[PDB]
Design a protein around this ligand. Sequence first.
Ligand SMILES: *[C@@H]1O[C@H](CO)[C@@H](O[C@@H]2O[C@H](CO[C@H]3O[C@H](CO)[C@@H](O)[C@H](O)[C@@H]3O)[C@@H](O[C@H]3O[C@H](CO)[C@@H](O)[C@H](O)[C@@H]3O)[C@H](O[C@@H]3O[C@H](CS(=O)(=O)O)[C@@H](O[C@@H]4O[C@H](CO)[C@@H](O)[C@H](O)[C@H]4O)[C@H](O)[C@H]3O)[C@H]2NC(C)=O)[C@H](O)[C@H]1NC(C)=O
Ligand SMILES: *[C@@H]1O[C@H](CO)[C@@H](O[C@@H]2O[C@H](CO[C@H]3O[C@H](CO)[C@@H](O)[C@H](O)[C@@H]3O)[C@@H](O[C@H]3O[C@H](CO)[C@@H](O)[C@H](O)[C@@H]3O)[C@H](O[C@@H]3O[C@H](CS(=O)(=O)O)[C@@H](O)[C@H](O)[C@H]3O)[C@H]2NC(C)=O)[C@H](O)[C@H]1NC(C)=O
Ligand SMILES: *[C@@H]1O[C@H](CO)[C@@H](O[C@@H]2O[C@H](CO[C@H]3O[C@H](CO)[C@@H](O)[C@H](O)[C@@H]3O)[C@@H](O[C@H]3O[C@H](CO)[C@@H](O)[C@H](O)[C@@H]3O)[C@H](O[C@@H]3O[C@H](CS(=O)(=O)O)[C@@H](O)[C@H](O)[C@H]3O)[C@H]2NC(C)=O)[C@H](O)[C@H]1NC(C)=O
Ligand SMILES: *[C@@H]1O[C@H](CO)[C@@H](O[C@@H]2O[C@H](CO[C@H]3O[C@H](CO)[C@@H](O)[C@H](O)[C@@H]3O)[C@@H](O[C@H]3O[C@H](CO)[C@@H](O)[C@H](O)[C@@H]3O)[C@H](O[C@@H]3O[C@H](CS(=O)(=O)O)[C@@H](O)[C@H](O)[C@H]3O)[C@H]2NC(C)=O)[C@H](O)[C@H]1NC(C)=O
Ligand SMILES: *[C@@H]1O[C@H](CO)[C@@H](O[C@@H]2O[C@H](CO[C@H]3O[C@H](CO)[C@@H](O)[C@H](O)[C@@H]3O)[C@@H](O[C@H]3O[C@H](CO)[C@@H](O)[C@H](O)[C@@H]3O)[C@H](O[C@@H]3O[C@H](CS(=O)(=O)O)[C@@H](O)[C@H](O)[C@H]3O)[C@H]2NC(C)=O)[C@H](O)[C@H]1NC(C)=O
Ligand SMILES: *[C@@H]1O[C@H](CO)[C@@H](O[C@@H]2O[C@H](CO[C@H]3O[C@H](CO)[C@@H](O)[C@H](O)[C@@H]3O)[C@@H](O)[C@H](O[C@@H]3O[C@H](CS(=O)(=O)O)[C@@H](O)[C@H](O)[C@H]3O)[C@H]2NC(C)=O)[C@H](O)[C@H]1NC(C)=O
Ligand SMILES: *[C@@H]1O[C@H](CO)[C@@H](O[C@@H]2O[C@H](CO)[C@@H](O)[C@H](O[C@@H]3O[C@H](CS(=O)(=O)O)[C@@H](O)[C@H](O)[C@H]3O)[C@H]2NC(C)=O)[C@H](O)[C@H]1NC(C)=O
Ligand SMILES: *[C@@H]1O[C@H](CO)[C@@H](O[C@@H]2O[C@H](CO)[C@@H](O)[C@H](O[C@@H]3O[C@H](CS(=O)(=O)O)[C@@H](O)[C@H](O)[C@H]3O)[C@H]2NC(C)=O)[C@H](O)[C@H]1NC(C)=O
Ligand SMILES: *[C@@H]1O[C@H](CO)[C@@H](O[C@@H]2O[C@H](CO[C@H]3O[C@H](CO)[C@@H](O)[C@H](O)[C@@H]3O)[C@@H](O)[C@H](O)[C@H]2NC(C)=O)[C@H](O)[C@H]1NC(C)=O
Ligand SMILES: *[C@@H]1O[C@H](CO)[C@@H](O[C@@H]2O[C@H](CO)[C@@H](O)[C@H](O)[C@H]2NC(C)=O)[C@H](O)[C@H]1NC(C)=O
Ligand SMILES: *[C@@H]1O[C@H](CO)[C@@H](O[C@@H]2O[C@H](CO)[C@@H](O)[C@H](O)[C@H]2NC(C)=O)[C@H](O)[C@H]1NC(C)=O
Ligand SMILES: *[C@@H]1O[C@H](CO)[C@@H](O[C@@H]2O[C@H](CO)[C@@H](O)[C@H](O)[C@H]2NC(C)=O)[C@H](O)[C@H]1NC(C)=O
Ligand SMILES: *[C@@H]1O[C@H](CO)[C@@H](O[C@@H]2O[C@H](CO)[C@@H](O)[C@H](O)[C@H]2NC(C)=O)[C@H](O)[C@H]1NC(C)=O
Ligand SMILES: *[C@@H]1O[C@H](CO)[C@@H](O)[C@H](O)[C@H]1NC(C)=O
Length: 1040
Amino acid sequence: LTPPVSAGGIQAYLLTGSGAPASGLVLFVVNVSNIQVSSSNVTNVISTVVSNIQINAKTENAQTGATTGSVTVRFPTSGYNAYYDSVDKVVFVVVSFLYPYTTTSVNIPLSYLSKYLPGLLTAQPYDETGAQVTSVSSTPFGSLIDTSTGQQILGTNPVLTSYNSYTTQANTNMQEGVVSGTLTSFTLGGQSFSGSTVPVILYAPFIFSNSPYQAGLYNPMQVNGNLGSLSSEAYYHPVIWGRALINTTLIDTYASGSVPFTFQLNYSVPGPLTINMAQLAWIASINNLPTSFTYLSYKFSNGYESFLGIISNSTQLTAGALTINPSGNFTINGKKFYVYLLVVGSTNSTTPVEYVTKLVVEYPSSTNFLPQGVTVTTSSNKYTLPVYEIGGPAGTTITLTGNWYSTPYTVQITVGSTPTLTNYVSQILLKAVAYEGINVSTTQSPYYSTAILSTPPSEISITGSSTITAQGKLTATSASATVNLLTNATLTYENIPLTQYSFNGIIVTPGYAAINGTTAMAYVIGALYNKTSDYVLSFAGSQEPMQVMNNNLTEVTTLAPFGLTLLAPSVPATETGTSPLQLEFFTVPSTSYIALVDFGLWGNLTSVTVSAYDTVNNKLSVNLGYFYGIVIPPSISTAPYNYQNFICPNNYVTVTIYDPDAVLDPYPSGSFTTSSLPLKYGNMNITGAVIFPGSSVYNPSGVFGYSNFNKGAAVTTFTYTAQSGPFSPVALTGNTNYLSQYADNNPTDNYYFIQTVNGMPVLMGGLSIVASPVSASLPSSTSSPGFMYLLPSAAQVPSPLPGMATPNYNLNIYITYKIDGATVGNNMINGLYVASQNTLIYVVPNGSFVGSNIKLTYTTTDYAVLHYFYSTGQYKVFKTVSVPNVTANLYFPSSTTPLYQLSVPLYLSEPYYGSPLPTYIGLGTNGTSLWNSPNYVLFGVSAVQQYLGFIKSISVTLSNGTTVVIPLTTSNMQTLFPQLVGQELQACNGTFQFGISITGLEKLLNLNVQQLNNSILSVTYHDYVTGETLTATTKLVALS
Ligand SMILES: *[C@@H]1O[C@H](CO)[C@@H](O[C@@H]2O[C@H](CO[C@H]3O[C@H](CO)[C@@H](O)[C@H](O)[C@@H]3O)[C@@H](O[C@H]3O[C@H](CO)[C@@H](O)[C@H](O)[C@@H]3O)[C@H](O[C@@H]3O[C@H](CS(=O)(=O)O)[C@@H](O[C@@H]4O[C@H](CO)[C@@H](O)[C@H](O)[C@H]4O)[C@H](O)[C@H]3O)[C@H]2NC(C)=O)[C@H](O)[C@H]1NC(C)=O
Ligand SMILES: *[C@@H]1O[C@H](CO)[C@@H](O[C@@H]2O[C@H](CO[C@H]3O[C@H](CO)[C@@H](O)[C@H](O)[C@@H]3O)[C@@H](O[C@H]3O[C@H](CO)[C@@H](O)[C@H](O)[C@@H]3O)[C@H](O[C@@H]3O[C@H](CS(=O)(=O)O)[C@@H](O)[C@H](O)[C@H]3O)[C@H]2NC(C)=O)[C@H](O)[C@H]1NC(C)=O
Ligand SMILES: *[C@@H]1O[C@H](CO)[C@@H](O[C@@H]2O[C@H](CO[C@H]3O[C@H](CO)[C@@H](O)[C@H](O)[C@@H]3O)[C@@H](O[C@H]3O[C@H](CO)[C@@H](O)[C@H](O)[C@@H]3O)[C@H](O[C@@H]3O[C@H](CS(=O)(=O)O)[C@@H](O)[C@H](O)[C@H]3O)[C@H]2NC(C)=O)[C@H](O)[C@H]1NC(C)=O
Ligand SMILES: *[C@@H]1O[C@H](CO)[C@@H](O[C@@H]2O[C@H](CO[C@H]3O[C@H](CO)[C@@H](O)[C@H](O)[C@@H]3O)[C@@H](O[C@H]3O[C@H](CO)[C@@H](O)[C@H](O)[C@@H]3O)[C@H](O[C@@H]3O[C@H](CS(=O)(=O)O)[C@@H](O)[C@H](O)[C@H]3O)[C@H]2NC(C)=O)[C@H](O)[C@H]1NC(C)=O
Ligand SMILES: *[C@@H]1O[C@H](CO)[C@@H](O[C@@H]2O[C@H](CO[C@H]3O[C@H](CO)[C@@H](O)[C@H](O)[C@@H]3O)[C@@H](O[C@H]3O[C@H](CO)[C@@H](O)[C@H](O)[C@@H]3O)[C@H](O[C@@H]3O[C@H](CS(=O)(=O)O)[C@@H](O)[C@H](O)[C@H]3O)[C@H]2NC(C)=O)[C@H](O)[C@H]1NC(C)=O
Ligand SMILES: *[C@@H]1O[C@H](CO)[C@@H](O[C@@H]2O[C@H](CO[C@H]3O[C@H](CO)[C@@H](O)[C@H](O)[C@@H]3O)[C@@H](O)[C@H](O[C@@H]3O[C@H](CS(=O)(=O)O)[C@@H](O)[C@H](O)[C@H]3O)[C@H]2NC(C)=O)[C@H](O)[C@H]1NC(C)=O
Ligand SMILES: *[C@@H]1O[C@H](CO)[C@@H](O[C@@H]2O[C@H](CO)[C@@H](O)[C@H](O[C@@H]3O[C@H](CS(=O)(=O)O)[C@@H](O)[C@H](O)[C@H]3O)[C@H]2NC(C)=O)[C@H](O)[C@H]1NC(C)=O
Ligand SMILES: *[C@@H]1O[C@H](CO)[C@@H](O[C@@H]2O[C@H](CO)[C@@H](O)[C@H](O[C@@H]3O[C@H](CS(=O)(=O)O)[C@@H](O)[C@H](O)[C@H]3O)[C@H]2NC(C)=O)[C@H](O)[C@H]1NC(C)=O
Ligand SMILES: *[C@@H]1O[C@H](CO)[C@@H](O[C@@H]2O[C@H](CO[C@H]3O[C@H](CO)[C@@H](O)[C@H](O)[C@@H]3O)[C@@H](O)[C@H](O)[C@H]2NC(C)=O)[C@H](O)[C@H]1NC(C)=O
Ligand SMILES: *[C@@H]1O[C@H](CO)[C@@H](O[C@@H]2O[C@H](CO)[C@@H](O)[C@H](O)[C@H]2NC(C)=O)[C@H](O)[C@H]1NC(C)=O
Ligand SMILES: *[C@@H]1O[C@H](CO)[C@@H](O[C@@H]2O[C@H](CO)[C@@H](O)[C@H](O)[C@H]2NC(C)=O)[C@H](O)[C@H]1NC(C)=O
Ligand SMILES: *[C@@H]1O[C@H](CO)[C@@H](O[C@@H]2O[C@H](CO)[C@@H](O)[C@H](O)[C@H]2NC(C)=O)[C@H](O)[C@H]1NC(C)=O
Ligand SMILES: *[C@@H]1O[C@H](CO)[C@@H](O[C@@H]2O[C@H](CO)[C@@H](O)[C@H](O)[C@H]2NC(C)=O)[C@H](O)[C@H]1NC(C)=O
Ligand SMILES: *[C@@H]1O[C@H](CO)[C@@H](O)[C@H](O)[C@H]1NC(C)=O
């Protein structure tokens, strides 16, 4: 039993799982294991147990945590049912608290209850009065006695009132019901008993929890200290960046086991926004197009092309040798009209190019001056209508011929040299909405905890409200008029006679980089002038959004019409009027974050609202969650370093990158993937993003929230793996066609997550390395994303929530010469390499080592930062690590030395020569010096014999100014330094001791040993590492 029941302890468990007879049942167990019992004397012991039990009960406000009512009771002297098991050694009782069975006992199958007490399968439980019995049943709550009052509980009490009335009271008054128990300490048989149960929750409404996080959602990083000033407010004003997960907890007392939930997010901004739009098609009656104009069709990102629609009375349009047949046909009250759809381009194309799938035209009906409309169709009455391309070389002109009513007309098109891109710039009130799902499980009923995406990759709709307006002029037999919409789109009506219709209109699409042409919305206005009691001028028009796929432009949904009416009895008149207008665009999965960021809904001023839905038991939340958005640029830093950092194998230079927008999952080393499907939400089905924790990618089938739902074999499973080459780098593997759809905390691949269009990413983010002078860079053109494994550091013990990510990425760099020319089979050690996890090795040759360097560049991983900060270059940062020059010296221990001594010290000192012990320098031939160091190891590679310098000359000046330079023959080096080898004095110290033989020097000169030999000694060495020479001297003295 989890949690445990203690020695001599009481404990309680709320009954749950399939086969549990009723809601609001709690069991109590007393661990009577500590004493002897038999059927002969059991009635004593069970009676002894029950009399000491006390039970407490409350009603609470589920949001605020306030106690509303409290009651406290004990079992009656008789009429209870209470039971014993010899096998599991417990006394126990079950009590039924909510309606029904508040007052009457409900039977409990011995099968079900045995799940908790398996002894009930081993043998029958004992009853009161000591018999074996086949069944267990509740003691009802209304039977018990008020400890305050010494009477059976009355129907007037608010707690018993509430418990019987929970069904509506949970929602209507935010009421929650809670119970706990305690066994008043007592002695039996020289043993004793004591305890208090953990609280159990009977019921509560379905809500976002509001304690301690008063917004229901929280960012673990803001709560710990790692975000500056904003940490002060983590409990009531949560923030998060664009593509990541934010944490939350729900209470659900209905469900059991795992539960799919679905969420609805609504995004909003204070004040109106300036938006860019572009013209896809212009549609008109042949009277409204101008006598001549110059035009050439534009081509959108998807590959679709702009078109021109002409409506006419005639069965053809005619142009000499060229005949143009209509695309479709319609009628208004028996009068017949045809629609011709044209692309002005390259050549007179006989077969179709693209289509409109369905298209609504709208007119004021004579019957009412109230809007009506129809779908234009083919002659065979099918819906999709062909569009055709026509034209020629630049500067060519075509005349088309047609009729409007009984009057012929001609229009002259000049095929322009450059595409006719046209824009509208409007201010709109805009808002958006989106949907999402995940499958949450719990270790602790009734609390379900999870995370959800800041921006789900799925269809989003963006919607707004604006104005349309007309100015008009009336005459005895005709009207003239103009309209404005979308701030600076203008349409103009040719003067309409009494008893004639005419049309104008536009299809428009957003004007930005990636998404142009992919979604659009159509407005067509019919107009009418007629006379009743007054002259009547009237407008009626469709508003309908569309999307483009496979050269079809299609009605996604169709909205309610609008109308305007102007009237006067006066023959001369000027008039004015206005109406609201609606505007809806729908996005597509790969494009959704980019779209929100471009339109301006995502930024430091954005606020989000969130509501939730339980798929299985069908409930919506009685409250909402709230959070706000953020955009933050990166920064780079390093711990101060000196010459020590490059001496010895256990030293390095640390660089830290601060970039919070690269943390997508708050657990460092966490991974999730995502796909798009239909989701159940309330009484409807909508598309939305489904999150799936792990390293695998799915193309799932069916509808999320029903038995139709099934996810097949993984299409790919990404992994970081060890690989070939010296050291052993860890790097990413997986089919990169699916890399958008995968999320991680590694900046060297994260920039793909939802940021790929036409198979290519919009941002080249992440880390870049270049190194000098031995020419090397990472990554090579050949490299996968995720060429190195690189993770954010995790929060430590005094932090409230340990083990969660900090925005710091900590990266370690080694530069050395000592392992140059080491080998690993065929491999030769040269240049730059990745090692372990966050580690780089740069290896160079001996003379190239001083002044060598690495430059690191960091570019942001998130498209919001590229958008708001492009102006200033604040989205990229640099740092450089370089090896400084150091002082070196050669010295005798004293300026003077006696010819009494046989030998003297001569010390060479240079920091960069220092290593682990032992290490030694062997001399020989023409003054060569060879460095050796068998205890040097670095990631398994080990140092080879290095030639670091040479002794240049060995000289004496004699007592008269004559100078002798001793030639560096083998015999001369042999005699002068019989200890041919120098030794390091202390670990990683720069110092070695040589010993120069004065008793040698005497004989070596062939001089009169002491007689003439008041002399000065002078010696010189050259090192390749600094490029300096070192020189040293001593006076040789004898008794005078
Ligand atoms: C905020 O919400 C975050 C949601 O993203 C939570 O992150 C999840 O953290 C889990 C562990 O958290 C525990 O420890 C932290 C301290 O770091 C505590 O604060 C928490 O209270 C909690 O105690 C983590 O679970 C995994 O690691 C556990 C080790 O601690 C281990 O016992 C589990 O078995 C998990 O492996 C989640 O990490 C991912 O978990 C999923 C499985 S599941 O989602 O847990 O069911 C793994 O997917 C699986 O991968 C295996 C490969 O071996 C496949 O075989 C299998 O098909 C597939 O399901 C992921 O690999 C693993 O990374 C982590 N969730 C995610 C998606 O990252 C976070 O804890 C919340 N914060 C707080 C304060 O509660
Ligand atoms: C969205 O709001 C975020 C919260 O303020 C902003 O994040 C903060 O970014 C600051 C640097 O960018 C600032 O300067 C730009 C022009 O140079 C301009 O776009 C904005 O003015 C923008 O805020 C950075 O603040 C530093 O610079 C400020 C100059 O305006 C100065 O007021 C600050 O004292 C600071 O030097 C923030 O970095 C953090 O600064 C903390 C100081 S405090 O602001 O908490 O007092 C410090 O404790 C911490 O170590 C350091 O990281 C940075 N804030 C955060 C949360 O890290 C963000 O830029 C706004 N986004 C937009 C769209 O502008
Ligand atoms: C698509 O079909 C259209 C309909 O038949 C064609 O439109 C006609 O275009 C003529 C020009 O096309 C010629 O020159 C092109 C080079 O710029 C070449 O690519 C074509 O192969 C073709 O040879 C145009 O003729 C006008 O321009 C001529 C310049 O070369 C010149 O002859 C005159 O200046 C002339 O006005 C047609 O316009 C009409 O021409 C009538 C005389 S005739 O040329 O038919 O003999 C004239 O009476 C009338 O005023 C004028 O409007 C024009 N036809 C119409 C009425 O649309 C188009 O070429 C086809 N496109 C391709 C290349 O496939
Ligand atoms: C949320 O997570 C729940 C787990 O916590 C999921 O329940 C598990 O469902 C498993 C199959 O999942 C697949 O089919 C679902 C449609 O029914 C679909 O919703 C899922 O997305 C997914 O495509 C199921 O595993 C059984 O079937 C497997 C074949 O797919 C087979 O490999 C298994 O051996 C197993 O028979 C689990 O159901 C039950 O599992 C018992 C234990 S075990 O064998 O898994 O160890 C088994 O004894 C019993 O016969 C079987 O019915 C089930 N897991 C558990 C432990 O309950 C749930 O589907 C998820 N909900 C959604 C909507 O995604
Ligand atoms: C440390 O760096 C020093 C500076 O770069 C290197 O110094 C160079 O020394 C070369 C001789 O060293 C060779 O033999 C060693 C055996 O004792 C061996 O350990 C070395 O790996 C290396 O192979 C010297 O090269 C010349 O002398 C050779 C006679 O031994 C002869 O065979 C060569 O043909 C060559 O003339 C370099 O001196 C300069 O060399 C120039 C050409 S190049 O060798 O640099 O390509 C030449 O144009 C010029 O006239 C001559 O003075 C000398 N390099 C420089 C630029 O001073 C030292 O070897 C490195 N130590 C190690 C072990 O890495
Ligand atoms: C419709 O869709 C396409 C494809 O995304 C887009 O073309 C690309 O536009 C960018 C810049 O976009 C902005 O400026 C143009 C006007 O120049 C506006 O129309 C847009 O609304 C944007 O405000 C061009 O610069 C691209 O040319 C490429 O530039 C790259 C550098 S970049 O950082 O500037 O993008 C170079 O690396 C490429 O070599 C070069 O081709 C252009 N891309 C292509 C493939 O032509 C259109 O502008 C969009 N048109 C509409 C209606 O807005
Ligand atoms: C565009 O013109 C089309 C004709 O070119 C119109 O299509 C016709 O629509 C009628 C009424 O909806 C439909 O019944 C016709 O189908 C034919 O019906 C014939 C019998 S009858 O209707 O002539 O009495 C049958 O011979 C046979 O079932 C169909 O051929 C349909 N006509 C054709 C030729 O398909 C269409 O209505 C028009 N669009 C508008 C809105 O004006
Ligand atoms: C839109 O244009 C149509 C032309 O394709 C018009 O069609 C006309 O049909 C009417 C019957 O409704 C018929 O009287 C016409 O027949 C011709 O009459 C000519 C002279 S006139 O009467 O138009 O002045 C003669 O020249 C000729 O030999 C006849 O064939 C017919 N008009 C034509 C010229 O064919 C129609 O008026 C119009 N519809 C709408 C919606 O207003
Ligand atoms: C009363 O006290 C006993 C002393 O604390 C204690 O027994 C110890 O705990 C477990 C045995 O009980 C559990 O395990 C079984 C499943 O194997 C369940 O059926 C049961 O409900 C309990 O969860 C055992 O591991 C441990 O060795 C025992 N310790 C010793 C040495 O006595 C019981 O936990 C408690 N009595 C009962 C039966 O609940
Ligand atoms: C219930 O009855 C049993 C006897 O049936 C009691 O167990 C005996 O107790 C004595 C001392 O108390 C022990 O020395 C024996 O080992 C036990 N005998 C048997 C037969 O087990 C038990 O103590 C009684 N319990 C109570 C509380 O009265
Ligand atoms: C979030 O947006 C949704 C739009 O889906 C809104 O919910 C709608 O409410 C309107 C009336 O305000 C009703 O016509 C619909 O029944 C609701 N829509 C659907 C599809 O359920 C609502 O405006 C926003 N909700 C919140 C949390 O404010
Ligand atoms: C490295 O080792 C040398 C050993 O020669 C150290 O030199 C000695 O320094 C102390 C004081 O620090 C003097 O008392 C001695 O006289 C020096 N020895 C000789 C032979 O002169 C040197 O201090 C060490 N340096 C570092 C950086 O560890
Ligand atoms: C390290 O610094 C030393 C000292 O300034 C440099 O060597 C000196 O400068 C020139 C070389 O251009 C020589 O002629 C002198 O003899 C050197 N001076 C001394 C004190 O002997 C050296 O250039 C620097 N090393 C590197 C490679 O950066
Ligand atoms: C759009 O045109 C194409 C012809 O390529 C056809 O696939 C489709 O039936 C039309 N409309 C739709 C998507 O119904």
